Design a protein around this ligand. Structure first.
Ligand SMILES: NC(=O)C1=CN([C@@H]2O[C@H](COP(=O)(O)OP(=O)(O)OC[C@H]3O[C@@H](n4cnc5c(N)ncnc54)[C@H](OP(=O)(O)O)[C@@H]3O)[C@@H](O)[C@H]2O)C=CC1
Ligand SMILES: NC(=O)C1=CN([C@@H]2O[C@H](COP(=O)(O)OP(=O)(O)OC[C@H]3O[C@@H](n4cnc5c(N)ncnc54)[C@H](OP(=O)(O)O)[C@@H]3O)[C@@H](O)[C@H]2O)C=CC1
Ligand SMILES: C[C@H](NC1=NC(=O)[C@](C)(C(C)(C)O)S1)c1ccc(F)cc1
Ligand SMILES: C[C@H](NC1=NC(=O)[C@](C)(C(C)(C)O)S1)c1ccc(F)cc1
Lengths: 259, 255
């Protein structure tokens, strides 16, 4: 069962937070791979500029729908109109995130909430919406996450708390769907340090560490989402890909799959 | 662990009207400590307070109010503190009422789980810290299996629980570096006795439940012993598997 770029040729894929960084990269790969793609963010021409670039690369469609993921209702009707546009949904790629920097937690609950709303809560809203379509297409879901979403790490509390939330939620939903005969794929991506303009500015000269390529990360998340893989791991450290895997949990879950 | 640690200690106990929250209250009382329990049901908070104000507690008060309200939680530590002239232990243990069900479109419960179960815990903490730094006190977040492993029918519940982990486990690290001598103990509990759970897993889940009594105590001990985490559950398999070695190792690698 090998991945084929040709696999994503007629698929109507949505990609959130595709204005820049990873998001944008996934947008291009999927574009060049000739497929209907809808990018969303909060940037007039920043999007207007990637849509153009997509069509050129060899898309098959390309639009955009600006709106902050803070307004749950935007995500509400976003999926709506993004669907009343491609005609159904074949693979949602939630990936957007409220911008965050490195800081020790003090009293910024507003920012704790923002994250826990944008980074997580909106991902549910987007899913609920896209589900019907997805169920009907046997779509795949891809929730981009971080190492911080698997391991405790200082200076990124509110951030990590949200990515952890996505695991606790999507992995559980995955299980319900499993037994609920629903044939909708659900991929979770734990990413290591990626060379985005965002990270390489929010951590450069601060939280010491080396990053991995951007585009190589985007397509990887893709082969993973497409192959209906459970989770995808992508980090430039061998020994990390080695440890980040927790089989104790896999077993405990299995053992508990009979109760 | 010696009970001569809790005696005369100022301890808060959210979710203390019934269930594990309540029992913890009694122990803190029999152990002659100062307690301020909360929840929503005034009537119930009355009954435990006196019961506590007779089990040996050096002081026992209650303050009803919904943790869905953020300024309430915020105003809760201030009064709870003045009531006992300072704070020693903060025990977040309250959860928004739920049940077993696949997920569908009730984001209201999804949004509320992360409000009551998670967001309020940060509120309670940020406002209780000063007094906690004021006595090298502790914090005790109560989680559960679903908070370490993914389980169906509790997606919402689990999401909030994983949040607590990512957050506090992340905060604790920031702490040991910030010269913040306040401990943070995450409790990972299996199935517990309490009716407000037992009555929800009626014929749907199979596992011999552990007793509130013991579970309640164990948690307190762990917090008193400043233990990063308390693993309590009847089943033997869990206590072993539930622990995460790779995460421990993967983490020790940054520090
Ligand atoms: N970069 C890294 O090192 C790592 C990244 N990750 C994961 O990668 C994914 C994306 O990160 P990355 O692409 O590098 O980061 P970027 O900051 O470069 O991209 C953020 C994207 O989010 C969009 N966005 C921000 N706020 C909102 C909002 N309110 N509504 C809609 N869109 C919004 C942005 O557009 P705009 O703000 O203009 O609306 C933009 O296109 C996340 O899921 C993240 O957790 C994980 C580990 C490491
Ligand atoms: N019993 C079990 O098997 C398990 C329980 N746990 C953990 O133990 C803890 C609680 O124990 P549990 O046995 O479930 O206790 P209960 O189910 O009996 O309920 C605990 C409390 O929640 C309170 N509560 C509900 N809504 C609110 C609110 N908005 N604000 C304040 N309090 C509220 C209730 O009082 P009121 O409604 O009057 O406010 C009551 O005191 C939770 O953190 C749970 O996550 C973990 C694993 C298993
Ligand atoms: C978006 C990016 N996500 C990351 N998540 C992680 O686990 C990495 C690899 C770390 C380095 C934090 O270990 S970086 C991020 C960058 C800065 C910030 F303040 C919060 C988050
Ligand atoms: C609050 C209580 N916590 C539990 N936490 C878990 O992980 C247990 C042990 C499992 C699910 C695995 O049996 S039960 C709970 C009670 C009712 C409900 F509908 C969902 C959760």
């Amino acid at each position: 069962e090998e991945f084929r770029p040709e696999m994503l040729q007629g698929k109507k894929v949505i990609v959130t937070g595709a204005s820049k960084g990873i998001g944008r990269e996934m947008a291009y790969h999927l574009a060049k791979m000739g497929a209907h793609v809808v990018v969303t963010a909060r940037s007039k021409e920043t999007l207007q500029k990637v849509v153009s670039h997509c069509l050129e690369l060899g898309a098959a469609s390309a639009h955009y729908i600006a709106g902050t993921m803070e307004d749950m209702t935007f995500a509400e009707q976003f999926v709506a109109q993004a669907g009343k546009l491609m005609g159904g949904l074949d693979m949602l790629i939630l990936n957007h995130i409220t911008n965050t920097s490195l800081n020790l937690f003090h009293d910024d609950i507003h920012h704790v909430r923002k994250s826990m709303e944008v980074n997580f809560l909106s991902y549910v809203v987007l899913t609920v919406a896209a589900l019907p379509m997805l169920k009907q297409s046997n779509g795949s879901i891809v929730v981009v996450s971080s190492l911080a979403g698997k391991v405790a790490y200082p200076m990124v509390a509110a951030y990590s708390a949200s990515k952890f939330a996505l695991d606790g939620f999507f992995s559980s939903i995955r299980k319900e769907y499993s037994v609920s005969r629903v044939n909708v794929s659900i991929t979770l991506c734990v990413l290591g340090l990626i060379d985005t303009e965002t990270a390489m500015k929010a951590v450069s000269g601060i939280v010491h560490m080396q990053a991995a390529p951007k585009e190589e990360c985007a397509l990887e998340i893709i082969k993973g989402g497409a192959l209906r893989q459970e989770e995808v791991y992508y980090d430039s450290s061998l020994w990390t890909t080695l440890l980040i895997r927790n089989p104790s949990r896999k077993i405990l879950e299995f053992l508990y799959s009979t109760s």
